[PDB]
Amino acid sequence: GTILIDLSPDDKEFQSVEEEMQSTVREHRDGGHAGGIFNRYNILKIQKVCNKKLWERYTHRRKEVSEENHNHANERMLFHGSPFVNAIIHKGFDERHAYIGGMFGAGIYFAENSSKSNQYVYGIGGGTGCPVHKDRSCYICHRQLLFCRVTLGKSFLQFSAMAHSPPGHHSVTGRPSVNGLALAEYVIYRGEQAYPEYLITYQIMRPE
Numbered sequence: 001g002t003i004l005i006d007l008s009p010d011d012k013e014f015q016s017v018e019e020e021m022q023s024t025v026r027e028h029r030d031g032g033h034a035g036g037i038f039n040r041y042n043i044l045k046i047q048k049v050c051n052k053k054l055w056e057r058y059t060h061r062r063k064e065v066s067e068e069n070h071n072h073a074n075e076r077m078l079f080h081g082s083p084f085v086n087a088i089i090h091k092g093f094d095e096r097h098a099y100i101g102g103m104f105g106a107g108i109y110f111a112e113n114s115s116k117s118n119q120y121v122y123g124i125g126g127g128t129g130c131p132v133h134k135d136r137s138c139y140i141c142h143r144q145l146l147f148c149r150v151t152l153g154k155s156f157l158q159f160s161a162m163a164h165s166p167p168g169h170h171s172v173t174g175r176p177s178v179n180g181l182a183l184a185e186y187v188i189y190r191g192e193q194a195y196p197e198y199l200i201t202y203q204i205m206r207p208e
Protein backbone atom coordinates (compact mmCIF):
# COMPACT_ATOMS: atom_id res chain seq x y z
CA GLY A 1 0.00 0.00 0.00
CA THR A 2 2.96 2.39 0.07
CA ILE A 3 3.57 4.92 -2.64
CA LEU A 4 6.57 7.26 -2.74
CA ILE A 5 6.11 10.79 -4.09
CA ASP A 6 9.20 12.73 -5.14
CA LEU A 7 9.43 16.27 -3.90
CA SER A 8 10.83 18.92 -6.19
CA PRO A 9 13.87 20.77 -4.85
CA ASP A 10 11.84 23.89 -5.62
CA ASP A 11 9.11 22.83 -3.15
CA LYS A 12 9.22 24.54 0.26
CA GLU A 13 8.63 21.12 1.79
CA PHE A 14 11.84 19.73 0.20
CA GLN A 15 13.76 22.76 1.35
CA SER A 16 12.57 22.60 4.99
CA VAL A 17 13.39 18.85 5.24
CA GLU A 18 16.83 19.36 3.65
CA GLU A 19 17.52 22.21 6.09
CA GLU A 20 16.69 20.02 9.06
CA MET A 21 19.01 17.32 7.71
CA GLN A 22 21.96 19.66 7.08
CA SER A 23 21.59 21.89 10.14
CA THR A 24 21.61 18.96 12.63
CA VAL A 25 24.94 17.46 11.55
CA ARG A 26 27.50 17.45 14.39
CA GLU A 27 30.88 15.95 15.21
CA HIS A 28 30.75 12.54 16.90
CA ARG A 29 32.95 11.23 19.71
CA ASP A 30 34.08 8.30 17.55
CA GLY A 31 35.92 10.65 15.19
CA GLY A 32 33.74 9.39 12.32
CA HIS A 33 34.25 5.68 12.96
CA ALA A 34 30.59 4.58 12.70
CA GLY A 35 29.13 7.12 10.30
CA GLY A 36 32.02 8.61 8.35
CA ILE A 37 33.86 11.93 8.28
CA PHE A 38 31.67 14.78 6.96
CA ASN A 39 30.19 18.18 7.84
CA ARG A 40 27.34 18.15 5.34
CA TYR A 41 25.43 15.99 2.87
CA ASN A 42 24.67 15.89 -0.84
CA ILE A 43 20.88 15.38 -0.81
CA LEU A 44 19.93 13.37 -3.91
CA LYS A 45 16.19 12.80 -3.38
CA ILE A 46 13.43 13.43 -0.84
CA GLN A 47 10.28 11.33 -1.13
CA LYS A 48 7.02 11.56 0.80
CA VAL A 49 5.93 8.16 2.11
CA CYS A 50 2.19 7.66 1.63
CA ASN A 51 0.42 4.68 3.18
CA LYS A 52 -3.16 5.03 4.38
CA LYS A 53 -3.21 1.98 6.65
CA LEU A 54 0.11 2.87 8.32
CA TRP A 55 -0.97 6.51 8.71
CA GLU A 56 -4.23 5.50 10.35
CA ARG A 57 -2.37 3.10 12.66
CA TYR A 58 -0.20 6.07 13.70
CA THR A 59 -3.10 8.55 14.22
CA HIS A 60 -5.06 5.93 16.21
CA ARG A 61 -2.18 5.50 18.67
CA ARG A 62 -1.52 9.24 18.70
CA LYS A 63 -5.07 9.90 19.94
CA GLU A 64 -4.72 7.23 22.63
CA VAL A 65 -1.53 8.84 23.90
CA SER A 66 -2.98 12.37 23.63
CA GLU A 67 -5.97 11.28 25.73
CA GLU A 68 -3.63 9.89 28.42
CA ASN A 69 -1.60 13.15 28.47
CA HIS A 70 -3.98 16.13 28.73
CA ASN A 71 -4.64 16.20 24.98
CA HIS A 72 -0.94 16.46 24.16
CA ALA A 73 0.67 13.89 21.87
CA ASN A 74 4.07 15.63 22.22
CA GLU A 75 4.71 15.00 18.56
CA ARG A 76 8.18 15.51 17.09
CA MET A 77 9.91 15.16 13.70
CA LEU A 78 13.01 12.99 14.21
CA PHE A 79 15.51 11.00 12.19
CA HIS A 80 15.82 7.21 11.99
CA GLY A 81 18.66 5.26 10.36
CA SER A 82 18.54 1.53 9.70
CA PRO A 83 19.50 -1.01 7.07
CA PHE A 84 15.79 -1.90 6.99
CA VAL A 85 14.29 1.36 5.69
CA ASN A 86 12.61 -0.60 2.86
CA ALA A 87 10.76 -2.85 5.31
CA ILE A 88 9.81 0.15 7.43
CA ILE A 89 8.27 2.23 4.66
CA HIS A 90 6.22 -0.74 3.41
CA LYS A 91 5.14 -2.48 6.65
CA GLY A 92 5.71 0.13 9.35
CA PHE A 93 7.83 0.24 12.46
CA ASP A 94 7.66 -2.82 14.71
CA GLU A 95 9.65 -4.95 17.16
CA ARG A 96 12.08 -6.02 14.36
CA HIS A 97 13.31 -2.41 14.16
CA ALA A 98 14.08 -2.22 17.89
CA TYR A 99 17.67 -1.78 19.03
CA ILE A 100 17.89 -4.63 21.54
CA GLY A 101 21.22 -3.44 22.95
CA GLY A 102 20.57 0.31 23.10
CA MET A 103 21.36 2.51 26.13
CA PHE A 104 17.64 2.75 26.95
CA GLY A 105 16.64 -0.85 26.37
CA ALA A 106 14.96 -2.63 23.51
CA GLY A 107 12.94 0.07 21.75
CA ILE A 108 13.00 2.02 18.51
CA TYR A 109 15.51 4.86 18.55
CA PHE A 110 15.12 8.33 16.97
CA ALA A 111 17.56 11.26 16.84
CA GLU A 112 17.44 15.05 16.65
CA ASN A 113 20.88 14.96 15.03
CA SER A 114 20.68 13.56 11.50
CA SER A 115 24.36 12.58 11.87
CA LYS A 116 23.46 10.34 14.83
CA SER A 117 20.93 8.41 12.65
CA ASN A 118 23.58 8.29 9.90
CA GLN A 119 25.74 6.14 12.20
CA TYR A 120 23.04 3.42 12.04
CA VAL A 121 22.32 3.34 8.27
CA TYR A 122 24.73 0.45 7.67
CA GLY A 123 23.95 -1.25 10.98
CA ILE A 124 24.82 -0.91 14.67
CA GLY A 125 28.04 1.08 14.93
CA GLY A 126 28.03 1.42 11.13
CA GLY A 127 28.31 -2.37 10.63
CA THR A 128 30.92 -3.03 7.99
CA GLY A 129 30.00 0.11 6.06
CA CYS A 130 28.57 0.29 2.56
CA PRO A 131 27.76 -3.02 0.85
CA VAL A 132 29.90 -2.24 -2.21
CA HIS A 133 33.17 -0.92 -0.74
CA LYS A 134 32.89 -2.01 2.96
CA ASP A 135 33.57 1.58 3.94
CA ARG A 136 31.71 3.28 6.83
CA SER A 137 32.94 6.62 5.41
CA CYS A 138 31.93 5.87 1.82
CA TYR A 139 31.48 9.09 -0.18
CA ILE A 140 30.21 7.24 -3.29
CA CYS A 141 27.37 4.98 -2.18
CA HIS A 142 23.83 6.28 -1.69
CA ARG A 143 22.49 6.23 1.83
CA GLN A 144 18.95 6.57 3.07
CA LEU A 145 17.47 8.03 6.27
CA LEU A 146 13.88 8.40 7.42
CA PHE A 147 12.56 11.69 8.80
CA CYS A 148 9.66 10.55 10.93
CA ARG A 149 6.63 11.83 12.85
CA VAL A 150 7.00 10.46 16.38
CA THR A 151 4.55 10.60 19.29
CA LEU A 152 6.43 10.95 22.59
CA GLY A 153 3.54 11.57 24.98
CA LYS A 154 4.83 11.72 28.52
CA SER A 155 8.55 11.05 28.15
CA PHE A 156 10.82 9.64 30.85
CA LEU A 157 13.91 11.85 31.14
CA GLN A 158 17.22 9.98 31.38
CA PHE A 159 20.32 12.12 31.92
CA SER A 160 23.28 10.26 30.34
CA ALA A 161 26.82 10.54 28.99
CA MET A 162 10.31 -5.12 22.67
CA ALA A 163 10.71 -3.61 26.17
CA HIS A 164 7.95 -1.57 27.81
CA SER A 165 7.93 2.16 28.47
CA PRO A 166 8.64 3.12 32.04
CA PRO A 167 5.40 2.95 34.02
CA GLY A 168 3.29 6.09 33.52
CA HIS A 169 5.33 7.13 30.42
CA HIS A 170 5.00 6.69 26.61
CA SER A 171 8.66 7.10 25.63
CA VAL A 172 12.17 7.75 26.96
CA THR A 173 14.31 10.83 26.26
CA GLY A 174 18.06 10.44 26.40
CA ARG A 175 19.40 13.86 27.39
CA PRO A 176 23.09 14.41 26.70
CA SER A 177 25.00 15.00 30.04
CA VAL A 178 28.64 15.29 28.80
CA ASN A 179 28.76 16.44 25.19
CA GLY A 180 27.46 19.94 25.24
CA LEU A 181 26.82 19.93 21.50
CA ALA A 182 24.77 16.69 21.20
CA LEU A 183 21.01 16.88 20.71
CA ALA A 184 18.54 14.49 22.36
CA GLU A 185 17.74 10.93 21.33
CA TYR A 186 14.33 9.35 21.97
CA VAL A 187 13.03 5.80 22.33
CA ILE A 188 9.52 4.47 21.76
CA TYR A 189 8.39 0.95 22.63
CA ARG A 190 5.37 0.72 20.29
CA GLY A 191 5.82 0.76 16.49
CA GLU A 192 2.53 2.58 16.06
CA GLN A 193 4.04 5.66 17.75
CA ALA A 194 6.06 6.61 14.64
CA TYR A 195 5.20 7.23 10.97
CA PRO A 196 8.03 7.27 8.38
CA GLU A 197 7.06 10.53 6.65
CA TYR A 198 10.08 11.24 4.45
CA LEU A 199 12.61 8.99 2.76
CA ILE A 200 15.81 10.95 2.18
CA THR A 201 18.45 9.68 -0.21
CA TYR A 202 21.88 11.22 0.21
CA GLN A 203 25.65 10.99 0.22
CA ILE A 204 27.97 12.22 2.94
CA MET A 205 30.41 14.82 1.60
CA ARG A 206 34.19 14.66 1.98
CA PRO A 207 35.39 17.78 3.83
CA GLU A 208 37.43 20.10 1.59
Ligand SMILES: NC(=O)c1cccnc1
Binds near residue numbers: 079
Ligand atom coordinates in the same frame (compact mmCIF):
# COMPACT_ATOMS: atom_id res chain seq x y z
N1 LIG B 1 18.71 4.26 14.59
C1 LIG B 1 18.75 5.57 14.83
O1 LIG B 1 18.46 6.41 14.00
C2 LIG B 1 19.16 6.03 16.20
C3 LIG B 1 18.69 7.25 16.65
C4 LIG B 1 19.03 7.67 17.94
C5 LIG B 1 19.89 6.90 18.71
N2 LIG B 1 20.34 5.72 18.23
C6 LIG B 1 20.01 5.27 17.01
Ligand SMILES: [Zn+2]
Binds near residue numbers: 131133135138140141
Ligand atom coordinates in the same frame (compact mmCIF):
# COMPACT_ATOMS: atom_id res chain seq x y z
ZN1 LIG C 1 30.53 2.50 -1.05
